[PDB]
From Swiss-Prot, chains A, B:
Belongs to the BetVI family. It comes from Medicago truncatula. This is Nodulin-13. Induction: Up-regulated during nodulation, but not by Nod factors or pathogen infection. It comes from the Eukaryota. Homodimer. The NT13 molecules that have dimerized without cytokinin ligand most probably lose their binding properties because it seems unlikely that the dimer can dissociate back to the monomer. Asp-67 from the complementary protein molecule forms hydrogen bonds with the cytokinin scaffold. Expressed in nodules, but not in leaves, stems, flowers and roots. Specifically located in the nodule cortex. InterPro entries: Bet_v_I/MLP, Bet_v_I_allergen, Plant_def-hormone_signal, START-like_dom_sf. One of its GO terms (biological process) is defense response. Disulfide bonds: none annotated.
Length: 163, 163
């Protein structure tokens, strides 16, 4: 029958940050070039803007410390008002024998009266090909890394409010 | 005057393992292809031998989960009798604006009466060029990752003696 087939696999994780939405958002989205290497000094070597002004359509690049390469982030949505940010990664994303078309990363930070904010993180894996095999470890890996970056930045900013 | 100049920067870390030298060594060196992905399921996707039989001269490759590339390990010394292992990495190793010729990784596991063994880890950074600038974070990074792999494997093997 020869159908066109695609899988979109969504993983969602939340946690409560002590840092306010606005500060966490500014740290990652506006000051990432400075803060990513300060928050993860032994993993992220450099974060820079390759193309664009910071909004939708911007291409950023993270360079990792040591023999772990580098990756471009293709910015898709930037919503300061609602502390929402989305970007895609297109290269070097095959998960074992499962090719992918893209991985999409999205967060939305929601102010909460008790603490700082609720950090709502999503990763979406878009599959290439006619079938699908993704283990729990690989699906969890993307969302753990992504939320891990956010937690590192939160922790840094709480310890050094000077940024 | 035009001298030939090279830096060799050595970082050394030790800790006491509960697992015996022989088992930790076998796990990493002989059964790495199986154990590395079990010990670090969300970071190391695959560990395979590309060339050789496992001894000196063998080339192994680690593939990392997600957009973090892959790296070849060029095996230099394999000493089962003394639980010693050395390998080099040659590619993708520039540390910021400091090019490197190679990074060498070495461990020696020494049986200890109280616990299992003393894990003696070393990383050596060989610099390319006429001057040198390496921050504490980058020097610490290599040895933390390396010792981190060993600790992950130790922990896995203690929880699953079936390997
Ligand atoms: C599958 C997996 C472990 C993905 C992790 N990669 C990433 N996770 C979060 N943000 C990123 N930017 C570039 N690469 C990124
Ligand atoms: C500088 C740094 C963070 C190095 C870490 N890289 C590695 N550390 C330990 N073993 C390895 N095998 C291949 N690459 C390896
Ligand atoms: Na940190
Ligand atoms: Na690097
Ligand atoms: Na790259
Ligand atoms: Na990459
Ligand atoms: Na709040
Ligand atoms: Na398809
Ligand atoms: Na583990
Ligand atoms: Na990969
Ligand atoms: Na590679
Ligand atoms: Na690599
Ligand atoms: Na012992
Ligand atoms: Na030189």
């Amino acid at each position: 029958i020869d159908p066109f087939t695609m899988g979109v696999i969504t993983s969602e994780s939340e946690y409560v940050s002590s840092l306010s939405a606005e500060k966490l958002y500014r740290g990652i989205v506006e000051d990432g070039n400075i803060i990513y290497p300060k928050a993860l000094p032994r993993f992220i070597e450099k974060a820079e803007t390759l193309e664009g002004d910071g909004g939708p359509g911007t291409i950023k690049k993270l360079t990792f410390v040591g023999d772990f390469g580098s990756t471009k982030q293709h910015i898709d949505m930037v919503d300061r008002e609602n502390c929402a940010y989305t970007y895609s990664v297109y290269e070097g994303i095959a998960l074992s024998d499962q090719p992918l078309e893209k991985i999409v990363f999205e967060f939305k930070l929601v102010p909460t009266p008790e603490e700082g904010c609720i950090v709502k993180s999503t990763t979406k894996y878009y599959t290439k090909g006619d079938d699908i095999e993704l283990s729990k470890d690989y699906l969890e890996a993307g969302i753990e890394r992504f939320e891990g970056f956010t937690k590192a930045v939160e922790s840094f900013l709480l310890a050094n409010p000077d940024y």
